[PDB]
Amino acid sequence: MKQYLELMQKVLDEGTQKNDATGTGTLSIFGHQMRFNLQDGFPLVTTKRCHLRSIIHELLWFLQGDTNIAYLHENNVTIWDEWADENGDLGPVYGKQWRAWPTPDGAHIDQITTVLNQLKNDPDSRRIIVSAWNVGELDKMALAPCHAFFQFYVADGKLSCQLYQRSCDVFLGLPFNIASYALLVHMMAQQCDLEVGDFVWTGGDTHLYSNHMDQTHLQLSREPRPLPKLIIKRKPESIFDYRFEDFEIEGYDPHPGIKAPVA
Amino acid sequence: MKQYLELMQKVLDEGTQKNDATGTGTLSIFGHQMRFNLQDGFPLVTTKRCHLRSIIHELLWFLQGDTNIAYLHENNVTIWDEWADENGDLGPVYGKQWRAWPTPDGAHIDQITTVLNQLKNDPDSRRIIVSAWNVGELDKMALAPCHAFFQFYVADGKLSCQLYQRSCDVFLGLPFNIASYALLVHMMAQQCDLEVGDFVWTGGDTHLYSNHMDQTHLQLSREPRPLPKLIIKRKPESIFDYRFEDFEIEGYDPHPGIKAPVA
Numbered sequence A, B: 001m002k003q004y005l006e007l008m009q010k011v012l013d014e015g016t017q018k019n020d021a022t023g024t025g026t027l028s029i030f031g032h033q034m035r036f037n038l039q040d041g042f043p044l045v046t047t048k049r050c051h052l053r054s055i056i057h058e059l060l061w062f063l064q065g066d067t068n069i070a071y072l073h074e075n076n077v078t079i080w081d082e083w084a085d086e087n088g089d090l091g092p093v094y095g096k097q098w099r100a101w102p103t104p105d106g107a108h109i110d111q112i113t114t115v116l117n118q119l120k121n122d123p124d125s126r127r128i129i130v131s132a133w134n135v136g137e138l139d140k141m142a143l144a145p146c147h148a149f150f151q152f153y154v155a156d157g158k159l160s161c162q163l164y165q166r167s168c169d170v171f172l173g174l175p176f177n178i179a180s181y182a183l184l185v186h187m188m189a190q191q192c193d194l195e196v197g198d199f200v201w202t203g204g205d206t207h208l209y210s211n212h213m214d215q216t217h218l219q220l221s222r223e224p225r226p227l228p229k230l231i232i233k234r235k236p237e238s239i240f241d242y243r244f245e246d247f248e249i250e251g252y253d254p255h256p257g258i259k260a261p262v263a
């Protein structure tokens, strides 16, 4: 996509070189923002084929609020395999914070439901927020949340959402991160009978790993194509009752997938 | 400032109208970002006279971690007056979260010290973050945190910082908000022996109140002047030992102050 390729070019032209944790080395910039009008089409990178199978299951898994990978293994989604323990546990990562942020008074806070109610009852609120950055539980998580916090906004019947991503692997992670949240906006919008607004992506340490440079150049030499369109097959009784099969993207005609090694 | 006026112009040109609670209307956009290279000068708007007296005291107050306004009263700082209770308490706002975020256990996390240590001993970390958005204690705070989250970054020996502000009164609040965080970056940088980098401001619901239109047109008609320079008279022994008198600003030659009613 236009903004995605501009970001890659910028990291290339203005990034600072580092040698890092493990010594991979990256080119990085700090602070960036992109905007996706969801009505223009689903923001799935066309300059390299990307599949959402794993992303969808993962998102449904986040919404259930469970952090054990049992569900993911049932559907052959290995995204979190590398960090789960022998019991398949991950600690209080995303889903747990999203659905049951522990309130020391004994109970927990369901941020997804709070936000649902705010969007329906008080859509002008300037604090319709979901945070996964639970400082007091970071030490118990298998990984520190990268997509740390998101906020919703409503104007003229359109639902917008801004995500703050503290760290971003532009080549490997970013295409999936955009699709995940674009998907969530659509689901939220549907559950509130609102149209879809903008997905605003904001990043902190935004980088390209050195061993992704050939792949990056290859991708930069390709032309973005029309964006696919997202189709939701039914309106579940709630944001918590969607199923993998409810989603389908049409009109997706990407350039060939590009394989690359993870960091 | 150039960046500041562009945002004000943008909200005026592209912002959506909203007449809601009580009637106080606003023109707002969602999602914005701007960057201030602190080496270019201290980012205090020049198109209207702004004072840092209250901001400096408030920052020092945040850093002490005390949320009782006694210190603010002793210094004739009225910022929180309207919100403190009979005993002058505000609940677990900013200061409390920064210095002692309550852990589920029977513990407290000092985010400021954590960040100091990361910057000194692991500057390339991609999770050098301070968050005031403690979901579990939100209902106990006098006001929901506006400048909710900030992240640091280091490149070529320069300290950068990005703030996520969920809600922003562009005319009245933003000038002080930029100055506060710019100041913290200078203090943090001094304490960690680094030069100053960029202060990146990222906003969520960014608005201009309807009753600030005359002031806005007036300020938009003024040309920005050279940025002033912050002077820190001595290097304290720690980020928690700064004093009001340590700070000075030179070369500040602003346009006349513009008075305006607060919502």
Ligand SMILES: CN(C)c1cccc2c(S(=O)(=O)N[C@@H](Cc3ccc(OS(=O)(=O)c4cccc5c(N(C)C)cccc45)cc3)C(=O)O)cccc12
Binding pocket: A054, A055, A078, A079, A080, A143, A169, A172, A173, A174, A176, A177, A262, A263
């Ligand atoms: C976005 N996330 C969280 C995902 C993570 C892992 C696999 C994913 C797959 S997949 O199972 O199909 N695998 C990919 C290759 C891949 C590898 C890592 C990666 O994740 S990342 O870019 O965010 C990424 C890059 C570098 C380091 C990562 C790290 N650290 C701590 C080692 C932890 C978590 C993610 C990391 C993204 C994609 C493939 O098409 O073959 C599909 C969709 C998303 C995936």
Ligand SMILES: CN(C)c1cccc2c(S(=O)(=O)N[C@@H](Cc3ccc(OS(=O)(=O)c4cccc5c(N(C)C)cccc45)cc3)C(=O)O)cccc12
Binding pocket: B054, B055, B077, B078, B079, B080, B169, B171, B172, B173, B174, B176, B177, B262, B263
């Ligand atoms: C949070 N910060 C930015 C501040 C808040 C209050 C007073 C401040 C002063 S001062 O003591 O010198 N007073 C100003 C007038 C004023 C009033 C509110 C305001 O705050 S704001 O633009 O962020 C602002 C605008 C609109 C609503 C606010 C709201 N609510 C819940 C009604 C709660 C908190 C802030 C609000 C900013 C300026 C003056 O010179 O007279 C100096 C510096 C910072 C102050």
Ligand SMILES: O=c1ccn([C@H]2C[C@H](O)[C@@H](COP(=O)(O)O)O2)c(=O)[nH]1
Binding pocket: A144, A146, A147, A167, A168, A169, A170, A172, A173, A174, A177, A263, B126, B127
């Ligand atoms: O959904 C994700 C999860 C992780 N990251 C990448 C960013 C970093 O390159 C790496 C995480 O490493 P740290 O920032 O935690 O060091 O994974 C993403 O881009 N997207």
Ligand SMILES: O=c1ccn([C@H]2C[C@H](O)[C@@H](COP(=O)(O)O)O2)c(=O)[nH]1
Binding pocket: A126, A127, B144, B146, B147, B167, B168, B169, B170, B172, B173, B174, B177
């Ligand atoms: O330091 C601050 C504190 C508040 N606000 C403004 C944003 C809103 O106009 C108002 C807070 O209102 P809510 O977003 O909470 O409704 O004060 C700022 O701009 N800066």
